[PDB]
Amino acid sequence: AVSKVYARSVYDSRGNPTVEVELTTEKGVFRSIVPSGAATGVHEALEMRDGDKSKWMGKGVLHAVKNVNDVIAPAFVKANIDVKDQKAVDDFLISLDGTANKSKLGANAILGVSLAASRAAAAEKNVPLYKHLADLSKSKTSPYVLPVPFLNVLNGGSHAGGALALQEFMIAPTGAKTFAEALRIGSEVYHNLKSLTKKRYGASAGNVGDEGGVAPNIQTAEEALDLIVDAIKAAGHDGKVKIGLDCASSEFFKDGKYDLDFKNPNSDKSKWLTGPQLADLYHSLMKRYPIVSIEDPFAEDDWEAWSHFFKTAGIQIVADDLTVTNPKRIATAIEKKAADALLLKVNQIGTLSESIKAAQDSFAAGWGVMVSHRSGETEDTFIADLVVGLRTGQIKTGAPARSERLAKLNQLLRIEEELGDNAVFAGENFHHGDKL
Amino acid sequence: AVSKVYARSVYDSRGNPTVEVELTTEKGVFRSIVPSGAATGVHEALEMRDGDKSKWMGKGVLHAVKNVNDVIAPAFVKANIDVKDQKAVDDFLISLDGTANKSKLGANAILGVSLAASRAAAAEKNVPLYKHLADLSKSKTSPYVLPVPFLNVLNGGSHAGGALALQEFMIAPTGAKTFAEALRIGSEVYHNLKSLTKKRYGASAGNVGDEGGVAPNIQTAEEALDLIVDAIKAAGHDGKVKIGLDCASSEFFKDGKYDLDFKNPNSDKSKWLTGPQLADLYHSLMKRYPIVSIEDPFAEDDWEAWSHFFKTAGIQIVADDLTVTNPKRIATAIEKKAADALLLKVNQIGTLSESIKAAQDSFAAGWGVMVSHRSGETEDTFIADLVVGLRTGQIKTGAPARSERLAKLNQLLRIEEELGDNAVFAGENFHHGDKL
Ligand SMILES: [Mg+2]
Ligand SMILES: [Mg+2]
Ligand SMILES: [Mg+2]
Ligand SMILES: [Mg+2]
Question: Where does substrate bind (chains A, B)?
Fold first, then answer.
């Protein structure tokens, strides 16, 4: 039985306040922390901020925290909910909020309680969190699937200077035999990339962005990709490391066109690309580079552009701001045939049950599911267990630098170690990891 | 009873492998992770690395891990040691190594067991870790003393691409009344410093170094210090924030002199400073800027320079590479009156007992003690509890960016919250927090 629900303000990887929740039962105290993205999708569940310009640059979470302590806590504890029944737990929270986008209590107030309950349930059942998550999601009993980690080793767009418009350049060691090996491989590539970057761009560029990847002033995507290839080759892993991209195109969508030079206040408008033109650009990058996944290639509501490209893409197309981990928007994407992979972010919807639901609807439509962190992370490692429990075979949780990233990757090492022979590495089959 | 001792490789904040140890007793599984510095002091205890160029850039810790699982674990488990007797635990580990600098098993193999045991003991005693550490060191808890955080928000030295010779530029919110206020103030100043840095130096300057601080290409310390001051003023915390420094002078100590331009290959040898000359420079920096602490202003073995400076230096003088948390080195520093504060790094010595002894010897000599992280950290939060347990009043665990840093800071927020009226914020009495 839950005897107490408590929330407090803590700091995320960017040094901005966020909500941390603790749920107390006879098994102990279970903690969960909420992540925070930047320039979030317009359709994401509401992240509640104080707005007090004299406190935390106006990014305080006192209101959210109060909502947990003075609203959810007393009601939740009095309801005597069975934490093992995740659906009951989240129906109560959703019903207490009463709004569609959780704007009353705030998604960052609800999620904490939702996630902490699942940890309390796992302990009650005396099983590893990923096992309980698998039960909650009706995943295969075995074999468990270790995911291929897509490491954002090079940042562009809003996460760096230069003209480079694309936001994320990831490497995925699909050629590894185990997660431990993929992670080793990934770190080696990353160190080779950092040394090359400092040598060609200087110490300044050698420094890392919010997710731990290098952020040199790159001019073009081809320049970035060639650097990634050189790093892979230098590391000795050519043929075993693939590339993933997060274009975050909504960032440069203007007048039905895409400005690949949106960082230049004097960008040539005659050079802005239309949907079909931006699609051809991706094709040229795909033909020259080992790209196996492309996230948000088009705007969050530019459905026709997504559908056109999907006709000939030929590789995993991941929807992030387009779907915002929302089953209602996922249905639309499926009907319009806009993509075939969901970037799953629990804080984009607000509850674990809804997130699991988004994943099931995706798999049911033949889609892949890439579990993801947010640009603003914490020492919390929930998504590590979540990606194993959902057996997706793929996760995006940062570069192999900065511990809000390594915390998850290290957790995956412990899970793999613990699973022993009761597990397989997604490898080349990451897209359909759940079918493994 | 300790039924099992196990070690595995995990990744630190820089993407390099390190040792993680788990000790199992009737109370559960207790985990500790070993930190890792860069350009470590010549006298530091041995951090054993594999040196296999075909794996982890030659930075693997398989040898250390094997020492734990193959040598320490069996003997330790059979010895049936009482984890609450930290002295006993550490005497056994040290005896098993039998070397002065832990060159046989490695400090990175021994430290994880030493730390894990103290966590297991705390659980056996049913008290929080900082409480057990207060008992182990015989520290006062009526009331506990919360530390003032020294946040390395501006990077220099070998950690920068300019001429800035000094390695670390920290801010210390000594004017706060609680740790919580101190951390918000620190983060606010940090965010102001970041934007100011990007506008004046460029986006690339906004990128963070290993410890989360900005790394702009600055030429002189004055330039860096003026920027920090503008950040403090812009944040609106004038007079409430002081500055700290980590010169890490050993880095630019060549031919008996100090080269403040050791980053330029054509550095003018006729301009290299001498012991007394470097002091004159610090003295002037102290007169114009709100500097309250200077670390490693002189070479790790250039005692004369240290002694001469301490003579007129009217602020706290921290010893890091000079003492390497070694009771023997500290004794020398005491007798020669080289400094008046110890930077306490558990992995520089190898065991908790020896670190506790170093702190005690320091306090007994009227010295201050600043608990510190290493440039290479992990999601481990031990130092947060240790600084509270040692009642030092001051800690250096990074800038308010990157979770291997926030993990400790957030844990201090939790400890403050849990203690309530049982704790007080050291503030301006940070130097003698133990006597508070
Ligand atoms: Mg986004
Ligand atoms: Mg995205
Ligand atoms: Mg050092
Ligand atoms: Mg130092």
Answer: 159, 168, 295, 320, 372-375, 396
Give the span between the Cα atoms of A111 and B353, in whole angstroms: 41
Give B248 Cα–ligand 4 centroid separation in angstroms: 6
For residue A238, the domain's CATH number is 3.20.20.120
End of a domain among A126, A152, A179?
A126
Q: What distances in angstroms separate CA B109 from CA B45, B66, B80, B104, one per listed residue?
A: 11, 9, 19, 10
Overall number of domains in chain B: 2
Same-domain status, B135 and B101: no
Contact B416, B179 (CB under 8 A): yes
B89 and B205 housed in the same domain:
no
Q: Å from B100 to nearest chain A CA?
A: 32
Co-location of B145 and B56 in the same domain: no
Instruction: Report the distance separating Cα B285 and Cα B215, nearest Å.
Output: 20
A107 and A224 co-located in one domain: no
Q: Which helix (H) or strand (E) holds A258?
A: strand A257-258
Catalytic-residue membership of B104: no
Q: Could you tell me if residue B295 is left (phi over 0), alpha (psi between -120 and 50 degrees) or otherwise beta?
A: beta
Catalytic residue among B345, B357, B404, B408: B345
Total count of residues recorded for chain B: 436
Helix, strand, or coil (residue B307): helix
The count of other CB atoms within 10 Å of the CB of residue A111 is: 32
- SS3 readout for A96-130: HHCCCCCCCCCHHHHHHHHHHHHHHHHHHHCCCHH
Looking at the structure, do residues A115 and A163 belong to the same domain, yes or no?
no
User: Residues B198, B206: contact at Cβ < 8 Å?
Assistant: yes
Verify whether the Cβ–Cβ distance A184 to B55 is below 8 Å.
Answer: yes
Domain termination residue (choose one: B126, B150, B185): B126
Q: What tokens appear for B81 in the block? A: 């040691």
Task: Give the residue among B346, B357, B350, B342 at the shortest CA–CA distance from B380.
Answer: B346
- Alpha-carbon dihedral angle through residues B300, B304, B309, B311, given to the nearest 10 degrees: 130
Respond yes or no on whether the N-terminal peptide bond of residue B290 is cis (omega within 30° of 0): no
* Ramachandran class of B423: left when φ > 0, alpha when ψ lies in -120 to 50, beta otherwise: beta
**Residue A251 and residue A370 in one domain:** yes
Longest dimension (CA), chain B: 65
Resolution, Å (one decimal): 2.1
Specify whether B158 is located in the same domain as B35.
no
At A73, which CATH number?
3.30.390.10
| A315 token code pair | 């590789």
3-state secondary structure of A158: helix
Cα–Cα distance for residue pair A416/A421, rounded to 1 Å: 9
- Cα distances (Å, whole numbers) of residue B120 to A415, B18, B71: 22, 21, 21
**Secondary structure class of A249 (helix, strand, coil):** helix
Please choose, from the candidates A352, A374, A329, the residue with its C-alpha nearest in 3D space to the C-alpha of residue A43.
A329
Q: Are residues B187 and B272 in the same domain?
A: yes
Residue by residue, DSSP assigns B116-150 as: HHHHHHHHHTTS-HHHHHHHHTT---TTEEEPEE-
Cα dihedral A25/A26/A31/A34 (nearest 10):
-20
Which range of residues forms the domain containing residue B47? 1-126
Across the interface, do A16 and B184 touch by the CB < 8 Å criterion? Answer: no
Per-residue tokens: A185: 């491989």
Among residues B114, B145, B97, B107, the alpha carbon closest in space to that of B32 is found at B114
